[PDB]
Design a protein around this ligand. Structure first.
Ligand SMILES: [Cl-]
Ligand SMILES: [Cl-]
Ligand SMILES: [Cl-]
Ligand SMILES: [Cl-]
Ligand SMILES: [Cl-]
Ligand SMILES: [Cl-]
Ligand SMILES: [Cl-]
Ligand SMILES: [Cl-]
Lengths: 188, 182, 187, 180, 183, 180, 187
């Protein structure tokens, strides 16, 4: 059950579920496993907010264990393409594609709360075909892995060699260690 | 009146006001007819303004995709296509079939023209799609792709047998989109 | 199913996309035919006739066919109501779906270029859908003949031609369907 | 279910005094039909009501609830068969107001009552043999009364699980007119 | 699908609730009983003087749920008329017979069975076992209620409730289970 | 908002009249909804009585205790009315209405007995241990003794038996004040 | 479940009972803690802060606990927002539920007389909820110590006392929870 609120607008009073009410504040929630359904809803929200004001910052709250790589890339490309800066805030956790999106927020505007944790490692499951008739072949997996490593090296400032070595490890960084690595700019 | 993110009500319906359609997930008759309905609605509301279809789809049923294809070509407005995430099979065919000059891909999206057997089989219990009809449809799909990409029929027929994804830049070079939005 | 919001005297209102097009006298006949969807189409035809008995109605058809008596409920309602019912095949029309396509108002039956049409009627459409109903062999043969007569009447083909061709479970292209008399025009 | 503006399509047609009896007959759909009939009577006890019937039949006492309500309310209840009417569906069709029972040209009508409609639908209810024979006779009497056939004829013919065409249903007295 | 009417929008049952009509339909259990109790209390508060009608088409069901309806019918100020359409069995039959004196009705092809099967008495919850002596107490209580409202003697009810046979509308009227067959 | 019996429902309309329905098994979900209605009613008017209609087989002890503590804490008097039955936690809450304002209808039944099932962990990772069960059983007995006027030894003996009391016997025992 | 409808000059507006209480700045933390309910609680906190950053917020807590990182999302949001967040235990609070109860604004943490509090954290709360995530032994130990430090800070107990007492999977009464520093007052 998602609670509702009633807010005054220029057009009169209107009812909102809590997430649509926070969308009016240019806040978007990326929560749970990443897949096409939820990634396309986030793409839709980013496009809508850009249409509403292309200059004002947008915030994505991230609490996600990661998930499907191409779904996460659709969010990534949309974040980069729209005119507004997209600020990222990790609460709870960001892993795999969740961590990649966190680290890809606008420079200076990536944040983690004190007890959140960040894991860059990309499990095989995120790369496999999600539809019954799609088999994702080894070379394409290797291309995607290098692509993700290059994106991380670029946004963190780490070298490519460093990202590719560290992404093999299946462990979490604390918010402070994630800030030190360049995955976020500030622990709030 | 009331607004939600997930079902000027839900986010998708608000963007439909902006002449934007989302083609997402597997293509089957249910979602293809919703897209046909959105296309016919937008043409009736304004037969002059462009329409955009965002495509993130692993493909699916061939006749359902052909329903979308025929509607796109038939209505008066130019239909622009944008690949986000991926486009495979019928999804790649539809991406390639947007209005000339108005087909786009985002930099990390991927495109695969290959059409698996599963798209051609009968979806209803009492329908059996026979081998000659499969070959006829595969050829028609190849000719549609040859026409919109500028590749020869022979090149399409050879390359569609491989089930590999192209990058967005490679898909532009192949003629499946006109521009990578970067 | 997306929504379309319009403002009015007393606030604003919301239609789903299908309801919005029903305002424009378009009906969607999509998916397998059964009693549930057939009665909804009958309800829409009756509503549009009562709203304006003079203006045409369009049914878009994308269907593999299905239950014969449910399709017959739609057929009789199309014939009975006052407005001309135009039909447009998008995707495919098989079995009862093809019969209803062919039964649109004369001159107003259409197919899109990549549409396909199959008149063949599989056994499954004729069998009992209810637990306590067993549809017997002679009734199947009788209904198969009634369907062939409807097709002969609307296509202009001989009953002998329809009976021969309906035994083959093969599709016609839009162009071949138009030449056969199943539609009047490829759009 | 499409909408018209704000009614769903069936509610919009209920405003025009049309009720849809569709699908298998059971207590749930019967009681919705009874409610609609009572509502329409209260709204206007003079104007005719129409019931569109497309149904394979079903539970006998649920059908009898509809039958008794059609007979009891003041408005004439016209019936129209679209698609098919079997078992209690056929009984209800034949029980519309005299002169106002219709069938469309390709509809079909079967008066036969399978054993399934008489059995207990609740777990703790067993419908016994003599009650079945009483109900079968009551249904036959209702059909003889509304069709004009003799009781003997109905009792013989109802044993066959065959459909009548719309024309043969009119000839038998199950409807007054085939509509074209 | 439950149709709607516009007058605001009402589903068909809420529209008829405005006309002080309640539908008791299907098997009786706590869920549906408490909804009927709420409708009775709502109608009493809206107008404690005007009659209420309950239409009953029910195979019966859980005894204590039915007793919740019975007690509420007796307690509220309005007369509660009952009308049997289709059938009334077990607790449904009891509730039909318990409408206000002179205002209990059956339609001509309605049927009524007072018999109470064992299933209505057993515990519906996981941790409740309804014991034999409590079943016997409740069976006697139901028989006393029927005797009071029908005018039959207690042992006449006890004899006839043992048989799981239906009464026609005419025979239910003759027995005192309703006052009138509406023709 | 549209109106139904089952948008604006019948229970919501009655909440406007300060009536709350406690119906069915007691668990966290329904108990938290009752706490919410109690807090809402107290904020709307802290002086007017509230009524809880109780028809319940009982259920989870800590869920019932959430309702109990909220009834005692809020300012309004909470009247309780048993319809159908009240067992276990349902009987405890009935017995805990405002003094003088606890009621039973003539055919309702009340069983104070607390089955083991109400005390066990409801979450997968919670094991409720034996000494905590004994502590809770004693607390519930103390609550019943206080509200009924019976001795603790009387409650402790009687709660062992999984038998129902009639409305008249519940009133005589002090579980309600009046049979209506 | 239930609705509250309020009349206005432009007709009627409707809430469910929880949304109506949200209007009074009360949030309900009920049932097992997981990402779904935790993100709903985070959103409610951020909304109430944006609506009025000065006024207190109350969380009613009736929970057997649950997923540790979901509860940590709520914890961090409670500490970050400007308003004081009061906590009230009704029923019970265990594991993450007990931690969040203890984490309300100093002096504004309450328990009702028959509620019970269990700080113990079962293994199940630390394990991966996602199919592709295995939460490893060293991360579990790190999270366990962090929870003990959070509890020590808010209760006033030493780290050693928390670490010893959290191993036992027993409940504290409301009065014992108050004496331990887990709430400030039994209401
Ligand atoms: Cl306003
Ligand atoms: Cl093939
Ligand atoms: Cl046969
Ligand atoms: Cl028989
Ligand atoms: Cl028998
Ligand atoms: Cl007979
Ligand atoms: Cl017994
Ligand atoms: Cl490990």
């Amino acid at each position: 059950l998602v609670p509702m609120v009633v807010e005054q607008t220029s057009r009169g009073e209107r009812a909102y579920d809590i997430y649509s009410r926070l969308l009016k504040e240019r806040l978007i929630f990326l929560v749970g496993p990443i897949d096409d359904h939820m990634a396309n809803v986030i793409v839709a929200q980013l496009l809508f907010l850009e249409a509403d004001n292309p200059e004002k910052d947008i915030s994505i709250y991230i609490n996600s264990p990661g998930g499907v790589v191409t779904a996460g890339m659709a969010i990534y490309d949309t974040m980069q393409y729209i005119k507004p800066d997209v600020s990222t805030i990790c609460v709870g956790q960001a892993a795999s594609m969740g961590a990649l999106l966190l680290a890809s927020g606008a420079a200076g505007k990536r944040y983690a709360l004190p007890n959140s944790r960040v894991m860059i490692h990309q499990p095989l499951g995120g790369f496999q075909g999600q539809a019954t008739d799609i088999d994702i072949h080894a070379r394409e997996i290797l291309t995607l892995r290098s692509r993700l490593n290059e994106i991380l090296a670029k946004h963190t400032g780490q070298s490519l060699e460093t990202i590719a070595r560290d992404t093999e490890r299946d462990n979490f960084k604390s918010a402070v260690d994630a800030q030190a690595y360049g995955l976020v700019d500030q622990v709030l």
